Design a protein around this ligand. Structure first.
Ligand SMILES: *[C@@H]1O[C@H](CO[C@@H]2O[C@@H](C)[C@@H](O)[C@@H](O)[C@@H]2O)[C@@H](O[C@@H]2O[C@H](CO)[C@@H](O[C@@H]3O[C@H](CO)[C@@H](O)[C@H](O)[C@@H]3O)[C@H](O)[C@H]2NC(C)=O)[C@H](O)[C@H]1NC(C)=O
Ligand SMILES: *[C@@H]1O[C@H](CO[C@@H]2O[C@@H](C)[C@@H](O)[C@@H](O)[C@@H]2O)[C@@H](O[C@@H]2O[C@H](CO)[C@@H](O)[C@H](O)[C@H]2NC(C)=O)[C@H](O)[C@H]1NC(C)=O
Lengths: 111, 214, 213
């Protein structure tokens, strides 16, 4: 009933290999029964749940900023394989609720 | 330049099913969500369905709930709407619209028309509306069902002063329109004016010359 | 649902006039409202997004303004090709709702109708019915009175009309009336007339033909 598609910034990220890369997923909740998921489009062409909070490869992490709406989707020690298209999604724990998919973003790993 | 086109619309009977497709190009089809919007003739626009980018979540209006199913293929870059238990209300032209999450319906396809009627498909009968300053040449596309019908002149080369009027449902239960062209009087003996009529539900294409026939 | 009421339903203004369309929502939709241009027989076109931002490729004359419930579309200098119907839609929540729609019509000087009459072709007589078609080309205002006179007798219930949408180039309309009769009905009578009374006509115009020629 409330269309609250999270925002997922920035659109493109360039980081040198070995440097930590962090995104920002912002979701304005209507209830506290909700989870945020961290997705990448695998070579299988599928949304791979990289991490999620509330709670894998610890190299992809998700942190809740104490502001109440913004979470940091972070990939430590970024590797050239990590390049691709990512997104975040929030699932309200409501009886029939589902996934609200944010817009996608790109990560690019350099030398 | 995002391109969206629909297909699969035609005459459907009360009940039964019909599948619609939306071919997508110009953007990454998986990155933005897709939606359907229907509009009965002489009515406003109505949201009907929506699907997420990956397809993990589908959204349906309460009117089409439990009857329509929206679906996506990412390798083919095409949006599908499987319509079941169709009713006479469902008659409308449905458009596929890309969604920028919040900025929904960012781009719109031309839309395909779905007719929900028990009557059978009938091919149009094109009759010449010949001339007897400015003269008028025309043709009468009559006794066809369902709509639409595309009418052009000289395979689209003649678009000056061409008036193709909307289809009016006559008492027989069949639509009928007339398309006319206004040209100088002396031009009737020079150029030659051909009418191009297309009715896809019956797949009948008729081309008739408009001769004054004095 | 978020009830969308859109005022006015229709409006007519001349070239270069400031038009105003009001979109009123049941519940507040923050800034999640979009405006769409739907030319007749075409797909909708995005004009204004996020209540007031202007979509690329849309002329700057269209302006959006609104906070909370009531938002407003405004065309700076109305143009002839701006003949279309405009809807407002919210992005706040499900189900997605649009307004009723506002039809903006271009205003022009009064145009005299060009009136022609066509007899039914011999091909259609073989089909069993006959259709005389009367044409009104490039006229304004939209409203006109079409009368069929079979043997100088007014016809009723045997005629059907359709009006063309307003032209983008010259802001004129076109009308055609079709009188449907049987083959025997066409063979009984000889002279059929089409009398049209319009504001741009000093005297009523009556185009007629005789069946024998
Ligand atoms: C990339 O980040 C990792 C840490 O991994 C995690 O994700 C990051 C994006 C941040 O959110 C981190 O806070 C988080 O742990 C770095 O590795 C380690 O980072 C910590 C900082 O948190 C460094 O300080 C240590 O922290 C630990 C607890 O985590 C304490 O026990 C220690 O006493 C110390 O304070 C730590 O030195 C560091 N370790 C190594 C081996 O690097 C990583 O350095 C960083 N790399 C880049 C390129 O930024
Ligand atoms: C919206 O969420 C915030 C934070 O939610 C917490 O963390 C989320 C990831 C999830 O685990 C939630 O279940 C958690 O509650 C809520 O902020 C909390 O508000 C309460 C009071 O209402 C306060 O006691 C907590 O300390 C707050 N915690 C944080 C981290 O801010 C907020 O209430 C939620 N609002 C809505 C609309 O549900």
């Amino acid at each position: 009933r409330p269309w609250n598609p999270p925002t997922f910034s920035p659109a493109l990220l360039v980081v040198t290999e070995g440097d930590n890369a962090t995104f920002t997923c912002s979701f304005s909740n209507t209830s506290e029964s909700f989870v945020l998921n961290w997705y990448r489009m695998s070579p299988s062409n599928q949304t791979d749940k990289l991490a999620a909070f509330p709670e894998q490869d610890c190299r992809f992490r998700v942190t809740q900023l104490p502001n109440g709406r913004d979470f940091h989707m972070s990939v430590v020690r970024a590797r050239r394989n990590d390049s691709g298209t990512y997104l975040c999604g929030a699932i309200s724990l409501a009886p029939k609720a589902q996934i609200k998919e944010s817009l996608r973003a790109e990560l690019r790993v350099t030398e | 330049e995002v391109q969206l086109l629909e297909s699969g619309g035609g005459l459907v009977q009360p009940g039964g099913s019909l599948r619609l497709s939306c071919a997508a190009s110009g953007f990454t089809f998986s990155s933005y969500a897709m939606s359907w919007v229907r509009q009965a003739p002489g009515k406003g626009l109505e949201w009907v369905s929506a699907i997420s980018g990956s397809g993990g979540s589908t959204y349906y209006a309460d009117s089409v709930k439990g009857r329509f199913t929206i679906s996506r293929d990412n390798s083919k870059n095409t949006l599908y709407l499987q319509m079941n238990s169709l009713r006479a209300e469902d008659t409308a032209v449905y458009y596929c619209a890309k969604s920028y999450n919040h900025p929904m319906f960012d781009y719109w396809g031309q839309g395909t028309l779905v007719t929900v009627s028990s009557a059978s498909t009938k091919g149009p009968s094109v009759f010449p509306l010949a001339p007897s300053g400015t003269a008028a040449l025309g043709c009468l596309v009559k006794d066809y069902f369902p709509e639409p019908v595309t009418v052009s002149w000289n395979s689209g080369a003649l678009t000056s002063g061409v008036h193709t009027f909307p289809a009016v449902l006559q008492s027989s239960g069949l639509y009928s329109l007339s398309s006319v062209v206004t040209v100088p009087s002396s031009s009737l003996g020079t150029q030659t004016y051909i009418c191009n009529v297309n009715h896809k539900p019956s797949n009948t294409k008729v081309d008739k010359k408009v001769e004054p026939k004095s | 649902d978020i009830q969308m009421t859109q005022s006015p339903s229709s409006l007519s203004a001349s070239v270069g006039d400031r038009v105003t369309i009001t979109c009123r929502a049941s519940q507040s939709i923050s800034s999640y409202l979009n405006w769409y241009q739907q030319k007749p027989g075409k797909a909708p076109k995005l004009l204004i997004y996020a209540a007031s931002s202007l979509q690329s490729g849309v002329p700057s004359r269209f302006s959006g303004s609104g906070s909370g419930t009531d938002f407003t579309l405004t065309i700076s200098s109305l143009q002839p090709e701006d003949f279309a119907t405009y809807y407002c839609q919210q992005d706040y929540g499900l189900p997605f709702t649009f307004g009723q729609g506002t039809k903006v019509e271009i205003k022009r000087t009064v145009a005299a109708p060009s009136v022609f009459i066509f007899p039914p072709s011999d091909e259609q007589l073989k089909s069993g019915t006959a259709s005389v078609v009367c044409l009104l080309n490039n006229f304004y205002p939209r409203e006109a009175k079409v009368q069929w006179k079979v043997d100088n007798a007014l016809q009723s219930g045997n005629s059907q009309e359709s009006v063309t949408e307003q032209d983008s180039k010259d802001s004129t309309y076109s009308l055609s009336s079709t009188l449907t009769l049987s083959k025997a009905d066409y063979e009984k009578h000889k002279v059929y007339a089409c009398e049209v009374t319009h504001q741009g006509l000093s005297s009523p115009v009556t185009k007629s033909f005789n069946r024998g020629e």
